[PDB]
């Protein structure tokens, strides 16, 4: 009941999804053979647990990899709908040219996955924004299914481009297109960025050789913690919608920030105590989150915190109220108790307490200002446009897309100034 269809997509989507299903198989005690030793898995003959998930890419590369690595037997081969021509970092190439040629089968399998459910609650996506395959295919799929399923909610665990050193040079174009699409037909654009992950792995775990495995494991932990207070017993339960309703005051204002706690090295593990005050110290610090927007250089329209662990309750609420009424400047004023909490009863594997802290803030306006600025600087010279027009598209969208982008921040800053 209240199932979830996981939609992969793009190279980043495939890798993060592999890591996510790894973490879920760990938590629910599933070995990589497929047996046990309904919210996510589907039962199959002989007690087998096949993950309710779908992979996709215009290239069979990362699919081949995740089918070769660990936990490659779980996902059924009917859900590996994959083209062989590749997209190649061209959003139009993966949203207008090959979109119409593979989206048919993708919608077919997604329908056969959703109808196979009884009472679906929401969707949940993992993709990038610059890479053609990820951004294009994923946002086209979101468009189709949201124009198909109107009542259920969306979830985009989207990795935005890093600020300083990009991964692709034409990144801002695909980024602004995907953010003008997802702002219209998606309820949570939970943004993640790599450089903050690097700063974390150097500052709060001491791993001086940060490989993508550890970053993917961290975002996997956050993603799992997002919904853990649903598939477990809870002193005060939550879901994908209690968040979604305690979070967004206005449907456009739905671009969150993420944070996980606690994070410790091997040396620090022995000494650091695990009680809700230091968990709060961590979850409300700047260098602890996974976003390129200093939370101390903005405010919080709202912020929810899912706890995990058999701990007290009065102290949770007391520390929430203290953190609020202390930094009342760093929070917004016109809303009362802008901090929402929830508590489950089962901690993760390896700890005893855990906090997934998500927040609808207004600091990400810096990130969108940076992206819009790069867009202007790369567009006012028609640079790299002869690709995005050879694939059936006129510059109009871009401008209007960027136009919509402006309005977005034009609201954020506004609400950061109102006082009543």
């Amino acid at each position: 009941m209240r199932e979830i269809v996981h939609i992969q997509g793009g190279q980043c989507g495939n890798q993060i999804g592999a890591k996510f299903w790894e973490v879920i198989s760990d938590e629910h005690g599933i070995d990589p053979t497929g047996t046990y030793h309904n919210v996510y898995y589907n039962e199959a003959t002989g007690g087998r647990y096949v993950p309710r998930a779908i992979l996709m890419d215009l290239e069979p590369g990362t699919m081949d990899s995740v089918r070769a690595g660990p936990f490659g037997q779980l996902f059924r081969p009917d859900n590996f709908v994959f083209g062989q021509t590749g997209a190649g970092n061209n959003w139009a190439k993966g949203h207008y040219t090959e979109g119409a040629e593979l989206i048919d089968s993708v919608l077919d399998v997604v329908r056969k996955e959703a109808e196979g459910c009884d009472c679906l609650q929401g969707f949940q996506i993992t993709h990038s924004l610059g890479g053609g395959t990820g951004s294009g295919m994923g946002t086209l799929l979101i468009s189709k299914v949201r124009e198909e399923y109107p009542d259920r909610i969306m979830e985009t665990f989207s990795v935005v481009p890093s600020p300083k050193v990009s991964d692709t040079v034409v990144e801002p174009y695909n980024a602004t297109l995907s953010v003008h699409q997802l702002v219209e037909n998606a309820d949570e654009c939970m943004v993640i960025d790599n450089e903050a992950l690097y700063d974390i792995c150097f500052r709060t775990l001491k791993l001086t050789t940060p490989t993508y495995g550890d970053l993917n494991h961290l975002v996997s932990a956050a993603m799992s913690g997002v919904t853990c207070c649903l598939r477990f017993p809870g002193q005060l339960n939550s879901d994908l919608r209690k968040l979604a309703v305690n979070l967004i005051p206005f449907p456009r204002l739905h671009f969150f920030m993420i944070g996980f706690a606690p994070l410790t090295s091997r040396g620090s593990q022995q000494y650091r105590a695990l009680t809700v005050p230091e968990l709060t110290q961590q979850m409300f610090d700047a260098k602890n989150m996974m976003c390129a927007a200093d939370p101390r250089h903005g405010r919080y329209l709202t912020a929810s915190a899912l706890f995990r662990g058999r701990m007290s309750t009065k102290e949770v609420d007391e520390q929430m109220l203290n953190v609020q009424n202390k930094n009342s400047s760093y929070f917004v004023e016109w809303i009362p108790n802008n901090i929402k909490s929830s508590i489950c009863d089962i901690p993760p594997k390896g700890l005893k307490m855990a906090v997934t802290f998500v927040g609808n803030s207004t600091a990400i306006q810096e990130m969108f200002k940076r992206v819009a600025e790069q867009f202007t600087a790369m567009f006012r010279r028609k640079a790299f446009l002869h690709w995005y027009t050879g694939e059936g598209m006129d510059e109009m969208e871009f401008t209007e897309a960027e136009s919509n982008m402006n309005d977005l921040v034009s609201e954020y800053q506004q609400y950061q100034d109102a006082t009543a």
Binding site: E59, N89, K164, V165, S166, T209, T211, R381
Partner: protein, 429 residues
């Protein structure tokens, strides 16, 4: 499922292709017997055991093709994909593009069609041709026009050996280089200018060998090509297909002449001595001493940089080093391209060709750059053109082969316009 075609036209193209196929057979672990004891990108299994390589060899002179037919690799290639003519090109572009070029290019198109039909997810084309040559320009340009009018959407990335501005191996390089440049301007999406001189000072400053020979040059170019294709070949943390390149590094459909660079380039004497840190390896990748094209990158301003790492690579120090490089005052990009670096990572170190003066090392960076200073090359090259067409030198050798006399002007004119754009981009806003 995904693969690339390999075409080798001309003389230098075929020799460097011989080296490249040696390296490819060595890396995957394929013996020159064809029997082996990832290859879908290059090879193709022959039902039971042996492998045929996706390749065609065009040259109107039998000598090099006879050598490869009686060399150490006589057993690998298909006995039809070694197409040989009967007369030299004689360095007059019209010879390999109008008179005899009409004779063999149709056979090349037949063979290319029959080689592509047995493929499924073909992506691009990697042609290899010196421009200074006769057939490396004429036949190459004719084949490129045929493939453009034939396939279309399929990417095309040549690796041309442009003549050095100082060293000379012929006296009519300007003519049959301008002609092939004007032909290839609109056909090949990404033309990487590989010079032949700067590699000499490279292998004299790094490998410390004083008297280098063409074979070393071809081995190094083979190393660059393998370091490029390793993404589709192998696995890695950041796979970058071939259709990635012509998507990141082509700002305007006309300006696509990029120069490459490769590191680490060091022989065994200092291999154990030097540390070769990621920071220092990417610092050596950017120093103007070891850019394959003879240019000082400081003259102009970069526009795009694709850096492909292979081997043991730690992304955090990668980003730190790239940031330091971005803060270096000696290098800077044009204003309108803030996101300047595209990066790919793989999970495989290089391999060594027994006899290759290079040394084995865990990490390798191949960095290609669409920049502006490269423009000057054309200018100086264009220079020579004047001092030939001011007296109609060697023109009758062209007019006698059907090519119209005044056509040169057009070509020359067109390159001027090319230079025009190489100044319309370097200006701020």
């Amino acid at each position: 499922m995904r693969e690339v075609i390999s075409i080798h036209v001309g003389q230098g193209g075929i020799q460097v292709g011989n080296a490249c196929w040696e390296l490819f057979c060595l890396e995957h672990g394929i013996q020159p017997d064809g029997q082996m004891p990832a290859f879908n990108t290059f090879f193709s299994e022959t039902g039971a055991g042996k492998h045929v390589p996706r390749a065609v060899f065009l040259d109107l002179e039998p000598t090099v093709i006879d050598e490869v037919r009686t060399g150490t690799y006589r057993q690998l290639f298909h006995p039809e994909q070694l197409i040989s003519g009967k007369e030299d090109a004689a360095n007059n572009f019209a010879r390999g593009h109008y008179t005899i070029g009409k004779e063999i290019v149709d056979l090349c198109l037949d063979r290319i069609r029959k080689l592509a039909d047995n493929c499924t997810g073909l992506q691009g084309f990697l042609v290899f041709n010196s421009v200074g040559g006769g057939t490396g320009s004429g036949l190459g340009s004719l084949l490129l026009e045929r493939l453009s009018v034939d396939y279309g959407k399929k990417s095309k990335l040549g690796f041309t050996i442009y003549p050095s501005p100082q060293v000379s191996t012929a006296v009519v390089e300007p003519y049959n280089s301008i002609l092939s440049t004007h032909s290839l301007l609109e056909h090949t999406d990404v033309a990487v200018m590989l010079d032949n001189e700067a590699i000499y000072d490279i292998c004299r400053r790094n490998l410390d060998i004083e008297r280098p020979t063409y074979t070393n040059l071809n081995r190094l170019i083979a190393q660059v090509i393998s370091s490029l294709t390793a993404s589709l070949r192998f696995d890695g943390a950041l796979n970058v297909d071939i259709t990635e390149f012509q998507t990141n590094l082509v700002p305007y459909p006309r300006i696509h002449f990029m120069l490459s660079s490769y590191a680490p380039i060091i022989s065994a004497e200092k291999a154990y001595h030097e540390q070769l840190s990621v920071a220092e390896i990417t610092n050596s990748a950017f120093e103007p001493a070891n850019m394959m094209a003879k240019c000082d990158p400081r003259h102009g301003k970069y526009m795009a940089c694709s850096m492909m790492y292979r081997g043991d690579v730690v992304p955090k120090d990668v980003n730190a080093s790239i940031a330091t490089i971005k803060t270096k005052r000696t290098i800077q990009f044009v204003d309108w391209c803030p996101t300047g670096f595209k990066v790919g990572i793989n999970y495989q170190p290089p391999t060594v060709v027994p006899g290759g003066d290079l040394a084995k090392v865990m990490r390798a960076v191949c960095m290609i750059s669409n920049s502006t200073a490269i423009a000057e090359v054309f200018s100086r090259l264009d220079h020579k053109f004047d001092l030939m067409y001011a007296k109609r030198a060697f023109v009758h050798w062209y007019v006698g082969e059907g090519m119209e006399e005044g056509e040169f002007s057009e070509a020359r004119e067109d390159l001027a316009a090319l230079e025009k754009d190489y100044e319309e981009v370097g200006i701020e806003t």
